[PDB]
Amino acid sequence: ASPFRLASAGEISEVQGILRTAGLLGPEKRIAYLGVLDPARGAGSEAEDRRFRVFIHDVSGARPQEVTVSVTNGTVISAVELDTAATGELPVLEEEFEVVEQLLATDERWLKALAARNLDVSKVRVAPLSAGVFEYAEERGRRILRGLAFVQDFPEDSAWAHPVDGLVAYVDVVSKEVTRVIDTGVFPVPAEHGNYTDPELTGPLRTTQKPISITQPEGPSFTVTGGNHIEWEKWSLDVGFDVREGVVLHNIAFRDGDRLRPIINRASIAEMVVPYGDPSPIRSWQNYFKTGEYLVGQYANSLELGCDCLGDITYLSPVISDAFGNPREIRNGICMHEEDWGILAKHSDLWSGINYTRRNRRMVISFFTTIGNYDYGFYWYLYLDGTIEFEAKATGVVFTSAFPEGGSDNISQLAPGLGAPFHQHIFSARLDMAIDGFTNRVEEEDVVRQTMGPGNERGNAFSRKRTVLTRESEAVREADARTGRTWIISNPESKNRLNEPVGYKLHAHNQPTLLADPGSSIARRAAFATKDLWVTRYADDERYPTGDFVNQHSGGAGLPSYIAQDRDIDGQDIVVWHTFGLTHFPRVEDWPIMPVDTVGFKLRPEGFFDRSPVLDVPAN
């Protein structure tokens, strides 16, 4: 009976029924987004009322709507018509991506471009990409997708090995018309194939790898109740799933002695943008907002035991809605398991004669998603010592282009004539903090060097300083690896036995942030990506760092708008938004299929406990 339980197939069917009966789901309507709403602040009087938020698109050109329904009472709470030219277009529908290639196939301009290159239209695949907002005034209020071509020689061929450069088209997916076809010139289409399962490319497979058996004879140490409530080594939390954000962690708490202490109320990856840095007009508009425009949860893979998740695995099979309101289960879309994590603590003391060693372990909650050529893994980790960590694993096939004769300052060569445009993968982790409760504050901590002189005669001293972020106007921070900068979230009203506010310290990897020019469209639409840490006052309607309707929005939505309210964040209900990502200059080793690369962050207790919280761990 938990308010955080996963949505059932029936609940989705109920939403569909409610919408249909209300006359909001006619033949031309499509569900672009559907997700359950989290309980509002308080809920003292559990008025069990499951509500769902829905974005309804209209393939007839009619205005879309944002609808909130109660499946508990079978009613429509609200239905507001949207003006997309102002607030943004709805997420792209899976069915719209498909129309791009089909439409271009009958367009004379597109056919002429292919004919000049001697490419069989039946062999040309088109990657349907988001459009963004640039200089095309005629696109305002219109639902546009831009297409890039790749040649697939046969059904099992990897089209990514054969990009068709110098060609790009724009399509209005509603009116179903090709608005523009741009041909800047012919580029040779890379000839080598990139079929990583072809013996001629892989060569003889290795026979040197001996098996590694990972098993748990007595089962896992974690328990799963209520379908998604996890309890493991003092940790307590609920594993949620949203079609937009994917796996979402709720009510992360730690059992300290006789009481369950909250740490984080809600943790999620609220946005993930992939901006490309190739100035060619063929791709200079390319920016993927995987979470906001595509909805990462929708493309979560069904994970295979022994392949994707090894060991004693417990799966969750979340249900999402299709474009018509029908429930669709993502079988084994979420993996949950614990794993050994080496030494936790060790000391061999000469004086006491006591030799002490203890092993560490971590709870893993993950899912993997595939969008076009991209495949990303999202992993959340909980450690015995109270550490919380997130890790993104990037793999898949690199997005390609032709490699210009004479070289390039924005593209790397992967194979003869095959290029890989430079780009970044930037994430935003939204952490609704709850350190021992909702009264929290954030301090920026920097190492402080000291000068040799009075009070420091030997010049060996060093210290640190903490600065409280009191208002949102001063809560947009940047990293400073040189000074070991971190951010501490504490509760000024909850102190440890040493009379110090309890807290958790966020450790960033300090990777580069958004590189685009400050005046670019992407810098405006993905402003969150330009700074490492943002702190806002909690608000029900502030869910994503990029706003609710990211697709083709002019910019400034999300964090920049929230921060502008300049609210008090010193000892209040606050939310931390951490930006982190990878800057990718593709290497030859990333082709034909990319070995995993990673990025993330972690938070460690900082005076949260009265002493080490793992003294009760037994000897293994």
Binding to Cu ion, residues 559-618 (CB under 5 A): 584
Nearest to 124 by CA among 116, 135, 133, 132: 116
Distance of CA 574 to the CA centre of its chain: 20
Q: Which is nearer to Cu ion, 104 or 394 (CB)?
A: 394
E strand or H helix at 30, and its extent? strand 29-36
Nearest CB to a second copy, comparing residues 106 and 598: 598
Site for a second copy contains 386 (CB under 8 A): yes
| 275 belongs to the binding site for a second copy (CB under 8 A) | yes
Q: How far does CA 193 lie from the centroid of its chain?
A: 31
* Of 21-29, 323-331, 348-356, 541-549: span binding a second copy (CB under 8 A): 348-356
Burial track 162-179 (b if 16+ CB lie within 10 A, e otherwise): bbbbbbbbbbbbbeeebe
* Smallest gap from residue 3 Cβ to a second copy (A): 27
Answer for which of 46, 258, 349, 540 binds a second copy (CB under 8 A) is 349
- Options 46, 258, 409, 541; binder of a second copy; rule CB under 8 A: 409
Compute the least distance from the CB of residue 353 to Cu ion, in Å. 24
The site partner of 4 among Cu ion, a second copy, none (C-beta below 5 to 8 Å per kind) is none
Half-sphere exposure of 203 (CA within 13 A, CB side): 2
Output 67 or 173, the one with its CB closest to a second copy. Answer: 173
Dihedral angle at the C-alpha atoms of 8, 10, 14, 16, nearest 10 degrees? 90
When CB distances are held under 5 to 8 angstroms depending on the partner's kind, the choice from a second copy, Cu ion, none that residue 21 binds is none
State how beta strands 486-495 and 574-584 pair. Answer: unpaired
Under rule CB under 8 A, residue 159 binds a second copy: yes
455: left (phi over 0), alpha (psi -120 to 50) or beta: left
Choice from 344, 439, 470, 570 touching a second copy (CB under 8 A):
344
Give the shortest CB-402-to-a second copy separation in angstroms: 14
Geometric angle at alpha carbon 554, from 548 and 556, rounded to 5°: 65
Which partner, Cu ion, a second copy, none, binds residue 123 by CB below 5 to 8 Å per kind? none
Say how many C-beta atoms besides its own lie within 10 A of residue 446's C-beta.
16
Copy the structure tokens of residue 346.
Answer: 């060790």
Cα-based angle 291, 125, 156 (whole degrees, multiple of 5): 100
Q: Which is nearer to a second copy, 69 or 599 (CB)?
A: 599
Q: How far is the CB of 537 from a second copy (least distance, A)?
A: 28
Residue 308 binding: pick among Cu ion, a second copy, none (C-beta 5-8 Å cut-off by kind): a second copy
At its nearest, how many Å lie between a second copy and the CB of residue 548? 24
Name residue 443's beta-bridge partners: 468, 488
Between 1 and 307, CB nearer to a second copy: 307
Q: Using CB under 8 A, which of the segments 39-47, 112-120, 300-308, 425-433 binds a second copy? A: 300-308
Q: Are 423 and 584 within 8 A, CB to CB?
A: yes
483 binds, among Cu ion, a second copy, none (CB under 5 to 8 A by kind): a second copy
Question: Closest approach of Cβ 215 to a second copy, in Å?
Answer: 5
- Residue closer to a second copy by CB (options 135, 541) is 135
Q: How far is the CB of 82 from a second copy (least distance, A)?
A: 27
Q: Does the protein bind a second copy through residue 305 (CB under 8 A)?
A: no
H or E stretch including 507?
strand 501-508
**Interface positions, 553-612, toward a second copy (CB under 8 A):** 583, 585, 587-596, 604-612
Nearer to Cu ion by Cβ, of 14 and 375: the residue is: 375
Determine, following the binding rule CB under 8 A, whether residue 613 of this chain makes contact with a second copy: yes
Segment near a second copy (CB under 8 A); pick from 166-174, 346-354, 553-561, 567-575:
346-354
Residue 165 neighbours by CB under 8 Å, 6+ apart? 187, 189, 280, 282, 401, 402, 419
Count how many residues are written for the chain.
620
Gap between the Cα atoms of 53 and 240, Å rounded = 15
Q: Which does 59 bind (CB under 5 to 8 A by kind): Cu ion, a second copy, none?
A: none
Question: Which of 17, 22, 51 lies closest to 34 in space, CA to CA?
Answer: 51
Among 14, 139, 157, 436, binds a second copy (CB under 8 A): 157
Structure tokens at 556: 């400034």
Using the minimum distance from each CB to a second copy, give the nearer residue, 82 or 296.
296
Cα gap 433→490, rounded to integer Å: 9
CB 15 within 8 A of CB 325: yes
Partner that binds at residue 279, options a second copy, Cu ion, none, CB closer than 5 to 8 Å by kind: a second copy
Closest CB 153 distance from a second copy, rounded Å: 11
User: Which of 27, 259 has the CB closer to a second copy?
Assistant: 259
- Phi, psi (5° rounding) for residue 564? -60, -20
Question: What does the alpha-carbon distance between residue 485 and residue 489 come to, in Å, rounded to a whole number?
Answer: 14
Please identify, using beta-carbon distances, which residue of 107 and 597 lies nearer to Cu ion: 597
Q: Which residues of 82-166 form beta strands (DSSP E)? A: 124-130, 144-151
Using CB under 8 A as the binding rule, the residues of this chain from 437 to 496 that contact a second copy are 447, 449-452, 455-464, 479, 481-484, 496
Nearer to a second copy, 21 or 102 (CB): 102
Q: Per CB under 8 A, does 357 bind a second copy?
A: yes
- Within residues 211-250, the interface with a second copy by CB under 8 A covers 211-221, 233
CA-wise closest residue to 427 among 265, 299, 246: 246
Task: Record the tokens describing residue 181, joined without a space.
Answer: 């076809």
CA distance 490 to 474: 17
Q: Which window, 45-53, 289-297, 356-364, 534-542, contacts a second copy (CB under 8 A)?
A: 356-364
Examine residue 57 and tell whether it contacts Cu ion (CB under 5 A).
Answer: no
- Cα–Cα dist 433/533, whole Å: 14
Q: What whole-number distance in Å separates Cα of residue 450 and Cα of residue 240?
A: 47
Residues that bind Cu ion (CB under 5 A): 584
